[PDB]
Scaffold this active site. Structure first.
Site, PDB file in Angstrom:
ATOM      1  CB  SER A 272       3.085 -31.623  21.936  1.00  0.00           C
ATOM      2  OG  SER A 272       3.816 -31.137  23.047  1.00  0.00           O
TER       3      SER A 272
ATOM      4  CG  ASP B 161     -10.197 -21.841  10.940  1.00  0.00           C
ATOM      5  OD1 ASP B 161      -9.400 -22.389  11.731  1.00  0.00           O
ATOM      6  OD2 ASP B 161     -11.386 -22.209  10.796  1.00  0.00           O
TER       7      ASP B 161
HETATM    8  O1  LIG Z   1     -14.348 -25.106  10.783  1.00  0.00           O
HETATM    9  C1  LIG Z   1     -14.478 -24.037  11.285  1.00  0.00           C
HETATM   10  C2  LIG Z   1     -15.153 -22.901  10.567  1.00  0.00           C
HETATM   11  C3  LIG Z   1     -16.109 -22.093  11.374  1.00  0.00           C
HETATM   12  C4  LIG Z   1     -17.479 -22.339  11.252  1.00  0.00           C
HETATM   13  C5  LIG Z   1     -18.413 -21.585  12.015  1.00  0.00           C
HETATM   14  C6  LIG Z   1     -17.957 -20.593  12.900  1.00  0.00           C
HETATM   15  C7  LIG Z   1     -16.542 -20.340  13.034  1.00  0.00           C
HETATM   16  C8  LIG Z   1     -16.085 -19.331  13.933  1.00  0.00           C
HETATM   17  C9  LIG Z   1     -14.688 -19.071  14.073  1.00  0.00           C
HETATM   18  C10 LIG Z   1     -13.745 -19.826  13.305  1.00  0.00           C
HETATM   19  C11 LIG Z   1     -14.186 -20.803  12.434  1.00  0.00           C
HETATM   20  C12 LIG Z   1     -15.636 -21.072  12.289  1.00  0.00           C
HETATM   21  O2  LIG Z   1     -13.796 -23.737  12.448  1.00  0.00           O
HETATM   22  C13 LIG Z   1     -13.169 -24.699  13.201  1.00  0.00           C
HETATM   23  C14 LIG Z   1     -11.781 -24.916  12.721  1.00  0.00           C
HETATM   24  N1  LIG Z   1     -10.940 -23.973  13.433  1.00  0.00           N
HETATM   25  C15 LIG Z   1     -11.804 -23.227  14.323  1.00  0.00           C
HETATM   26  C16 LIG Z   1     -12.972 -24.108  14.536  1.00  0.00           C
HETATM   27  O3  LIG Z   1     -12.654 -25.107  15.414  1.00  0.00           O
HETATM   28  C17 LIG Z   1     -13.146 -25.050  16.755  1.00  0.00           C
HETATM   29  O4  LIG Z   1     -14.208 -24.436  16.964  1.00  0.00           O
HETATM   30  C18 LIG Z   1     -12.718 -26.160  17.723  1.00  0.00           C
HETATM   31  C19 LIG Z   1     -13.373 -27.545  17.522  1.00  0.00           C
HETATM   32  C20 LIG Z   1     -14.524 -27.888  18.252  1.00  0.00           C
HETATM   33  C21 LIG Z   1     -15.125 -29.154  18.074  1.00  0.00           C
HETATM   34  C22 LIG Z   1     -14.563 -30.089  17.149  1.00  0.00           C
HETATM   35  C23 LIG Z   1     -13.376 -29.733  16.396  1.00  0.00           C
HETATM   36  C24 LIG Z   1     -12.804 -30.676  15.462  1.00  0.00           C
HETATM   37  C25 LIG Z   1     -11.647 -30.323  14.730  1.00  0.00           C
HETATM   38  C26 LIG Z   1     -11.064 -29.087  14.907  1.00  0.00           C
HETATM   39  C27 LIG Z   1     -11.625 -28.156  15.830  1.00  0.00           C
HETATM   40  C28 LIG Z   1     -12.796 -28.505  16.569  1.00  0.00           C
END
Ligand SMILES: O=C(Cc1cccc2ccccc12)O[C@H]1CNC[C@@H]1OC(=O)Cc1cccc2ccccc12
Length: 305
Positions: free
Chosen positions: A174, A35
């Site tokens: 981008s 990730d």
């Molecule tokens: O931090 C975690 C860890 C994590 C915790 C719990 C379940 C997980 C399951 C799969 C992978 C990672 C997990 O995952 C974030 C970073 N990349 C995957 C995910 O981002 C998005 O969902 C998307 C997302 C939405 C809303 C706000 C955001 C702000 C910053 C970056 C991403 C955002």
């Protein structure tokens, strides 16, 4: 040193990718979701998941008093694709995904009171080059490499672009987009390269322009995003990296029926409105060979493949 590990979709939709990682001595192999949008290595530990059992590892040590957010933290030997880091923080948590391996900047690591380094940051002190690459497959396995660039894995040249680490992400800008065979619009779109997010989340203006080209597509508040007739053929989506272009084929944007047997399908490009940030997730990244350059001044590279 270098490492090279195969990453495999967890299902027929590429909802996420898992990569085998060896933890402890003797090795315990767990399938982790790499990730680039977070910075913790956390694992299920002692409904189907394989668990890490530190009591069975001769190299495990409790990191006394440290917690993440909440669970405990150990240090142990961790290997990815032949690349080994000793003293890696492994965060213990309470079915194809056995945990996460974070590859964003260590400033986002949640361990308290002593913040911990990512596997990549720890590995830098041994890597031939301070880089890792993501080469995700479309409905197929791909590869994560550490410490080298595989020049046989892409076509043309790699276009590098500036990264801001201010928010702890691989955040870049981008240079624009095109829908299908349409004209390229030059416009700055700030966002993050996030291998842990499935879809491509972009500003509402951009996303509306894309879906307007698909007959019958609409945003459904009931479903939680753009949906389209399963009978549709989707246009490609192009994003700019400097003067270069990465083309996402239409098929990559199809995430299948919203519920089993439905004639409404879920779109792979969605609005970032409400998230607070644009996210170049797997839908975008899997169309490219992506270099995460962790040199003193970090940058991001994209090549077609
Ligand atoms: O931090 C975690 C860890 C994590 C915790 C719990 C379940 C997980 C399951 C799969 C992978 C990672 C997990 O995952 C974030 C970073 N990349 C995957 C995910 O981002 C998005 O969902 C998307 C997302 C939405 C809303 C706000 C955001 C702000 C910053 C970056 C991403 C955002």
């Amino acid at each position: 040193s270098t490492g090279s590990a195969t990453t495999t979709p967890i299902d027929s939709l590429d909802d996420a990718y898992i990569t085998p990682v060896q933890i402890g001595t003797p090795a315990q192999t767990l399938n982790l979701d790499f990730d680039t949008g977070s910075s913790d290595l956390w694992v299920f530990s002692s409904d189907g998941q394989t668990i890490y059992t530190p009591s069975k590892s001769t190299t495990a040590k409790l990191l006394s008093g440290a917690t993440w957010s909440s669970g405990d933290v150990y240090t142990d030997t961790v290997s990815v694709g032949g690349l080994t880091v000793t003293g890696q923080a492994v965060e213990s948590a309470k079915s194809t995904i056995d945990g996460l391996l974070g590859l964003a900047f260590s400033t986002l690591n949640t361990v308290s009171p002593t913040q911990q380094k990512t596997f990549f940051d720890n590995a830098k002190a041994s890597l031939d080059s301070p880089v890792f690459t993501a080469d995700l497959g479309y409905h197929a396995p791909g590869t994560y490499n550490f410490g080298f660039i595989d020049t046989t894995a892409y076509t043309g040249s790699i276009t590098y672009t500036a990264v801001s680490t201010k928010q702890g992400f691989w955040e870049w800008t981008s240079t624009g987009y095109a829908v299908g065979s349409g004209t390229f619009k030059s416009t700055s779109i700030d966002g993050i390269a996030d291998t842990g997010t499935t879809l491509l989340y972009l500003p509402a203006t951009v996303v509306s322009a894309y879906w307007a080209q698909v007959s019958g597509a609409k945003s459904s508040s009931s479903v939680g995003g753009y949906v389209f007739p399963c009978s549709a053929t989707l246009p490609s989506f192009t994003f700019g990296v400097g003067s270069a272009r990465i083309v996402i084929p239409g098929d990559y944007i199809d995430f299948g029926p919203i519920s089993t047997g439905s004639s409404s399908c879920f779109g792979g490009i969605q609005s970032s409105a409400g998230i607070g940030i644009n996210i170049f997730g797997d839908v975008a990244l899997k169309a490219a060979f992506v270099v995460f350059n962790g040199a003193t001044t970090p940058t991001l590279g994209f090549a077609s493949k």
